[PDB]
Amino acid sequence: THPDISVDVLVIGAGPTGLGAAKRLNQIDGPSWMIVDSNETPGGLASTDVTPEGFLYDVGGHVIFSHYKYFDDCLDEALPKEDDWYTHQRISYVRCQGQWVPYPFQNNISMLPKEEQVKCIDGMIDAALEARVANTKPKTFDEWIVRMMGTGIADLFMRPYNFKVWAVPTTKMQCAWLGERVAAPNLKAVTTNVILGKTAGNWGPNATFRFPARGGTGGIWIAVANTLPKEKTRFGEKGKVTKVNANNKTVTLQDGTTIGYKKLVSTMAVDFLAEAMNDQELVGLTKQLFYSSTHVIGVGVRGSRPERIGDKCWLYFPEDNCPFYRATIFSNYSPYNQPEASKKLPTMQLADGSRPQSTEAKEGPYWSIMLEVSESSMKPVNQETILADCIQGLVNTEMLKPTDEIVSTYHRRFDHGYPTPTLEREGALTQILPKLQDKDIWSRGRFGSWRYEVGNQDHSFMLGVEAVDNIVNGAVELTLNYPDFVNGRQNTERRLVDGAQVFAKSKAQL
Amino acid sequence: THPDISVDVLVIGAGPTGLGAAKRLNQIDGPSWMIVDSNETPGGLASTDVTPEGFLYDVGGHVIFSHYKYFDDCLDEALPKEDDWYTHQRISYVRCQGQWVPYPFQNNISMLPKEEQVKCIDGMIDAALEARVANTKPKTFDEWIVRMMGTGIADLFMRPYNFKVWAVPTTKMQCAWLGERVAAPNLKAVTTNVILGKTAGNWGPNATFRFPARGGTGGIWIAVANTLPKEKTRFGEKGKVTKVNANNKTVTLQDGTTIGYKKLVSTMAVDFLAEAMNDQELVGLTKQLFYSSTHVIGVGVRGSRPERIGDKCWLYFPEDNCPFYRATIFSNYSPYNQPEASKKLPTMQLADGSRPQSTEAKEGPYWSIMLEVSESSMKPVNQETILADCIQGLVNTEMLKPTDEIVSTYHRRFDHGYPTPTLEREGALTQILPKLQDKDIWSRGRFGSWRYEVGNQDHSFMLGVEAVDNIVNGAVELTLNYPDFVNGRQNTERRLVDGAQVFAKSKAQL
Amino acid sequence: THPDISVDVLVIGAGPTGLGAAKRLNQIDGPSWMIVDSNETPGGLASTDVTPEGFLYDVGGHVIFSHYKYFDDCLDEALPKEDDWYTHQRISYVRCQGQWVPYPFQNNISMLPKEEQVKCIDGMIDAALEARVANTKPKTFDEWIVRMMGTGIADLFMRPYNFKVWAVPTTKMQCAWLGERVAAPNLKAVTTNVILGKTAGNWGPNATFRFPARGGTGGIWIAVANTLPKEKTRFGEKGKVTKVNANNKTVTLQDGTTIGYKKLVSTMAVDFLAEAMNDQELVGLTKQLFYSSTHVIGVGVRGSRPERIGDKCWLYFPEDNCPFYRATIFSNYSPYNQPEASKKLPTMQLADGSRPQSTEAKEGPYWSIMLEVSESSMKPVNQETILADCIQGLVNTEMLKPTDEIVSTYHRRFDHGYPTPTLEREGALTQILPKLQDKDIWSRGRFGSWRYEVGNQDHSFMLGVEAVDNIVNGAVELTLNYPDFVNGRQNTERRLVDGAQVFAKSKAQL
Amino acid sequence: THPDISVDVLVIGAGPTGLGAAKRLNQIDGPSWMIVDSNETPGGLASTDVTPEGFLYDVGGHVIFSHYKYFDDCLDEALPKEDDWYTHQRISYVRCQGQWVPYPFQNNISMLPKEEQVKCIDGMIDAALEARVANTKPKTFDEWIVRMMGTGIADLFMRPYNFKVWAVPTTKMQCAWLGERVAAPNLKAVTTNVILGKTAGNWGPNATFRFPARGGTGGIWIAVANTLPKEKTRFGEKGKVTKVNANNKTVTLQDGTTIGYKKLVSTMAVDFLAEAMNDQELVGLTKQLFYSSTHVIGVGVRGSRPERIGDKCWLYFPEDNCPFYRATIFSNYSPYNQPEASKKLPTMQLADGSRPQSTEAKEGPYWSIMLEVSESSMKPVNQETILADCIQGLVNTEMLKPTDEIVSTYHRRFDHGYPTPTLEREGALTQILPKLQDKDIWSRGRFGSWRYEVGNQDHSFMLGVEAVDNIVNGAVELTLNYPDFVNGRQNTERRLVDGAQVFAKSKAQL
Ligand SMILES: [Cl-]
Ligand SMILES: [Cl-]
Ligand SMILES: [Cl-]
Ligand SMILES: [Cl-]
Ligand SMILES: [Cl-]
């Protein structure tokens, strides 16, 4: 019995990974293909939301750094106009003992209190000496931290912060993922800065970045998707997958529709995929994986951007005076992430949690703060108090004065927020993924393949691109299996226009 | 003024690298292409000669170990029959002080004289203690050797042997090339074997290998070339490139024929290429490279295979009692590498150099020995004596009895034999290659790109495949730039039939 | 009330330590002095017993190596005749798995079975690598052993043997005592000998030694004692100390005699001394010390010296097939340690424990074996079976054939045999000794000061000499407080005739 | 032919070493002895001079830290009255870049400029990392310095200062001598101090010291000499040795007197001694030694003690703005080192070298500065200028205002000042000293035995004491051969009243 639809390559999910697949499928223009998503708006976790008050919020505050020229190509194609983008410098700090320590923390001990400087420089001297002699490798994230930074910085920042964000102890995570995530501090340079009182916040791929002028980051993915042939997309309730029959290569949609595929690129969470397959073995396997949920909190506030806030981009909060691990001055990325000054809005509450002296709609201007709070079986959070707790936290960290007027609030919980690089992860993935591929199913993405090291938007996008390129041109999936390889190089070879398309164009013009 | 011929991609050279380009160009079947070679017979350095007496000789005794499924696919296509191949186990030894030390030498100290064992175990102990503390990297091949094996093994085997093959002292070479070439010995394992008297000759990719039943390895490349559209090839005097005009992208052949190209894949020696471009800058750059010439000496001998020879495949000769660094019992690979026993041949001489007691043509059977002797500006060789010196060497090493009857002899000198991994190499290549690429010229191959670590038949074949794959599909050239990456994995993704071809075939079906 | 006798310096005990004290007191001939001992025969633990059958036995088999010229002087004086001494070369072995391994064990791995050689060479490699990097110090004897020899040699010899002798686990002992006792094996030299099959039994002060022709080592001390003025000695029941009144410096003897002293040199076991002082605090401190008792077993056997025995001097037994840790072929030291061949003796029993076939007194010649067995609260021994058990052990270790005729037997238990270098030792001694000295009591000797590293006869002799030299001439007690100092040098300065006596002699000549 | 005088032991030189010998010869009161010196006043280099203006100057500013109770006893005997001594605390600083860095320099990096702190903390970090792994020993003082402090502190202080004092480059000196002279800095402690801004100037034996109320240190040795039997001393021109006839053990004095000896304790510089012996071999040997001369400069200045000067005791000057390596505020040690306030003196010059506005004799009070300048074949110094140069330096280092009134000046050059611990030293001494002893000559003292490690007054005194003790009581000369042993312990055994004298006294009481 024939399926309602038959394609060579079926793409499930229209987030960055899925759209990457679609883009390369569309570029090659060889096999037939189709992309579906239960959401009417493509973008997935890289989408932007809006409060009724006109405040925009990305899903946690997303800053792009591109490792791939291909990813750049597709962005330039979607938002080609110069004024589609703003370019910014990374102003990042960590909140430690009343003071803002420039990112990364481990490289800026100099901004700490004297007593704390001691504990830190001590830990590093120890670690540098043991390292001069070490011949074994760190078994856990935690060991790596101690080995690389010493007990001083471990206890002061690394350990408490990482629990606050991963929702699992540092001793429960693996060490291989953090090539380009965590900076290994040089003893000599660190003490030199302590002596001099200088800073060093240039480490990391976040140096300088682009942000879309309108629509938040979610705008990019809407623009990218628009380059696809509408009839090959199926977004909304009509595109919600409810069943995957690996054995006879057919997917079933919510509305009963059936799609037949030769090859399946799934970008939904691999545990949901296992469920949708009714494959008991895979379900059990995926159940060995671990993830944290993410609460994204949005706070719209009236007033000119306080000088105390300055041009800070994102801030890290290791201390326990606030529930959130990171905050972003989202209003700094684009003036279109919040209403214009002329827009009149009533004050909902003051930062201290009290009623405003006036509930009349007043003018702005406005600024915006975006928060993230992790959740897991090891770190539960109370949904009905988290917004209030977050706002208090903003007070406690002197992000807001208790008098500051709050004009808009945003709170949304994303079940699958972070794929946790646990000690167990690979043992599971090295079974799950191979077994899926033996069924002609490329499971890829932040939760498709579950590898955070390679879980950024560009990474995800390329996972989709490279899956297709593997399916069609026999390309090695570098991003999936070799995070350090792709992350350590400039990937310039693959382009939105490869030789193939050039030669075909010229043969058609004769 | 139009050229006689115009193709999208022109391939110069039909050795493995060139043919690799061809097979993928021919597979993709997109851009137009053409392949030329000055030799009527494709195969390059991987081809086979035959003496008038019917004894075959490869260019030094070639053994195939594949790192790529794609390579395997093309061999299977060209020689699909089970009985087209022989599969063998590596029986390799090193000749040291009257005894046969199993390969690798450094892993079998137990087979040496007691006095020599001491010198070696001592060396390793020292090295192992300094390694426990070392934090810098070796600057030369020689340092690497000392660090990894100790002075004992360095002076006994490594140092003398490597000069005898590379034709340059170990102190003039770089350390980066030897990932899978030189075995780093483990002190405990080595001494445990010395105590017990056990061996360990399983290290290396050569464990089990296959070899063509007929025509030598050259038979493979003739077969592979036959799967190409004949009309797209131009082999022989008609295909000899004499001039390359990079500025207007046209090549000129010996017979005056002009060929225009959009992309050039050049597999000739990059120094010859620079010469053919009349590009002074590149000629100067290429002259900073270094290579050794290779003398291949063949000796056909009458008699049943001596038990003293046994099933030995190839043998290493570090000592100075013979000029050759290696010997291959070529007759062991295939019964068709030498005449049948029923064939009658006259004896040309005895191993000791004297005349045969009888110049009548007697029967066999026969066995065959193939020698290699290196030459360079640092190690000259006398061509008119080398054959004789080699035969004497065979006597001194007890490979031949002074009474053994020589039936056939072979000697040929190949100017460009080994691309020497000198210290200066990369300094030159990282200038030569990029500058060539800016002219849309992909120089690839054993001398096309000059990197030995990736200079085997499968490496070369792939260098060509990947050059095309980069030109057409924007694939990254992994084999060229990341030897250790391609050598350390199973490269299974690229196939002689990719999804592209499958999907196009099914689209033409309906 | 005046005491019966009053001397300036009183010496309790006429072992080597006491005799040393006396000899220098007598040389200086300044302060008045006196030496007492409960034994009619001076010598203490360095005395010799005789069986009724005419078989001599030292208290464990004593071999002199002199660190002091002073010690040499007194022996030359006591036994000045050339033929008073025999000179020997140390032939020492360790009984391991049916074989005799030359001393020291850790230096002769070559003589072990192959399977065991591997275990050992492995341990040493591990330890050599850890050592290359170690920066801390060993906390226990055990740790020291591992660090210096590896787990292989530790489990095979060091750990089992050291318990067998010290009667306490190697984990319970300190590491500082073994400067010149335990050899630290060099990895390269060891493996070099395993490869070649050579030996290395020259390590240690025991190389070549001299032994008294007559009266066992006990003869020496009788002779030394005879050079003292008889009226200044009091040996026997008349010289047994029963009370020490530190407060009014008066000693009381068994026969009621009281002796007044200004300075006391006590060479009795320091725990006995505290008891004799009725000093509760010191008693409590001394009880923190630990010692092992020694069983000395003597076996006289009929027959020419078996060739299997050869010229072996002393032998170490780490295995558990015999209760003794060491055996000495005491008959080898001097022909006068056992009866002449012409002497007729009845056989008491056979080595297998059976009755002899003849109980008539037959002739010799004879040889003699001396054994040692340790006892402690951690290692009890059954006195009534130990002799039989020892004789069986001599059979199991093939020291005796079950047929060998045993002519004489000897067994005596010395309560204070070895002062155990426990972890707790120095904590107690650094209180005990100074507190005793504050009372003008120099407690010195193998059990007077309780320090094994400095507990040989010469050491003890010199402890007494230096004690007196401190009392009279303000000399620093080097042997007591700096074992490594005196052991690591040639002590040539102090002589039996110092300038003092030379100048006095010359002033009396005028 | 008999000598005019005959003694058992003859002592040449009445500095601290000679007087040490005499004191013990006098205590023992056994052999006959006699001490001679070419100076009417005993003290040697530890004697005091006086300027006509009434200003005292030690030979460089001598500060006593006693390692020996014996030394203490003799000083208590010579100067028994409480008010014979002043007790002080070590206030010591190093002059670096306009600031006073508390001694030791290496432990107080915090007091440096920020740019310099970096250079130093960097060097230590490097050093600490190499030390974690080092397994060889330093071949020179310089290497020791680098290894122990880093190139930072090496270039800033150690290297320049040590040449400025030793008159030789740090690379020309040996490493063994500096157990208690140079402090090995702990990285963690140093950086902790840099961070906190704290100090640490307690390291060293100089913590708290005592100084003779009257007569400078010279008063001590005058008082000590006075305790000797006058008739056994021969000081002055009458005591000047001119010949030493080692072969018939007779010494010849200036006035022709001949002294026969049995043992000779020579404290004159061993080079002069070899000369006096007319022993060619020893002359050659002694010429292999090296020494630096010492210029002592004394500056008396009118005025109350400037607050700028404070209670500083001695100060180190590594920088090249002054010729002197050390300065002492001698006036701070005792009020009797300079005239009383009431004394009237004319101003000789101003600190700037100009004439005084008034040559009338005005009152005080006064203060005194003592400087030291080194000289050698590698570092000449111009005698006629040095005084002025030194005064200028005092100006440059802001020790003196150019207006300060200089009342008195002192300058004297001591040919033998410092025995240089050169690399060659021991190779010479280990021949010189033993060869001398085979002749019954004990050469001892700062230049008698030439070892600086053990060349302070107490060390010297004891070298003499121990020499006599070796001659008479067969005592080991610990201070001569084991500097580290004596320096690292409290030497409490040898006293001015030993048991010997006590017992002899009580024997004569009966
Ligand atoms: Cl070529
Ligand atoms: Cl006792
Ligand atoms: Cl019998
Ligand atoms: Cl002198
Ligand atoms: Cl004036």
Curated annotation (Swiss-Prot), chains A, B, C, D:
Which GO BP terms apply?
cell wall organization
Please tell me where FAD binds in this chain.
17, 37, 45, 60, 62, 241, 326, 446, 455-457, 460
Give the first-level EC class, as a single word. Answer: isomerase
The positions annotated for binding UDP-alpha-D-galactose are 60-61, 103, 106, 158, 161-162, 166, 181, 206, 316, 326, 418, 452, 456
Q: Does the keyword Metal-binding apply?
A: no
User: How changing residue 446 to A affects the protein?
Assistant: Lowers the catalytic efficiency by a factor of 2000
Q: A GO molecular-function term, please?
A: nucleotide binding
Extract the PANTHER family matched here.
AMINE OXIDASE DOMAIN-CONTAINING PROTEIN, PHYTOENE DESATURASE
What is the name attached to this protein's record? UDP-galactopyranose mutase
Species lineage, top-down? Eukaryota, Fungi, Dikarya, Ascomycota, Pezizomycotina
